[PDB]
Amino acid sequence: KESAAAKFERQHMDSSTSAASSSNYCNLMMCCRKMTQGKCKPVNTFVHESLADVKAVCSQKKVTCKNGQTNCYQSKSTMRITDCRETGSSKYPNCAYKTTQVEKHIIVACGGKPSVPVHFDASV
Amino acid sequence: KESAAAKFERQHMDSSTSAASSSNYCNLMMCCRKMTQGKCKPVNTFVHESLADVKAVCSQKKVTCKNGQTNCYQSKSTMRITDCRETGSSKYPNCAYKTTQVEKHIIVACGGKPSVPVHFDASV
């Protein structure tokens, strides 16, 4: 069981750089964050902001998911992000990527599974 | 923080016993759990079950709250609980309580949380 929130974090969070280091970054991280196992993942975005700042998006502008869902939210401010695009010469097992550093509003799907007791009402 | 979820736990959770030791149990716990400060809390219920079993109730039978609210749920199983009722001789600063150990379905107000990112949708 990998949680969707850990999978998101693994696939999309990078608080260790403020910007994609060089032109190799996506080739490294897509390797490192395991998105090149079995296939090459064509596109992926890393966000160079705190996990707090990224989580806070779940309480910001509500907009629609691309697939038709509604649990998608948009960041008030822009964020430092890195778009990683699979190139033409890419062919599993040898996956290559283009690294692109931009500052754009992100849009994420915000889910959850935990409801907790906050008041004891009665017994029956 | 103290979180509402911590206030609940402090006021209502006791996984160290499965049953009230003696009849002083509430005088101990009500005092220890900080419920005799400033005033005496007339009634309180402790649950002698794991914090997991109590949490999972938030994803069980939804029933109506006592004040009219709807964020209340009822336990599939009965649970070992201890009720503490302020007694006749009770008077702040000296709060006395009556102890009653029963096994009943509990009902809690669940202040759910659904705030984590699970998929990156777009940038804009």
UniProtKB/Swiss-Prot annotation, chains A, B:
Modified residues (Deamidated asparagine): 67
Assembly mode: Homodimer; disulfide-linked.
Cellular location(s): Secreted
This protein's record includes keyword Hydrolase: yes
Molecular function as annotated in GO: identical protein binding; lyase activity; nucleic acid binding; ribonuclease A activity; RNA nuclease activity
GO cellular component, one term: extracellular region
Additional free-text comment from the UniProt record: Progressive deamidation of Asn-67 transforms the homodimer (beta- 2) into and heterodimer (alpha-beta) and finally a doubly deamidated dimer (alpha-2).
EC number: 4.6.1.18
Main function: This enzyme hydrolyzes both single- and double-stranded RNA.
Protein name listed in UniProt: Seminal ribonuclease
Tissues where the protein occurs: Seminal plasma. Can reach 3% of the protein content of this fluid.
Residue span relative to the full protein: 27 to 150 of 150
Biological-process GO terms, alphabetical: defense response to Gram-positive bacterium
Enzyme class: lyase
Binding positions for substrate per the UniProt entry: 7, 10, 41-45, 66, 85
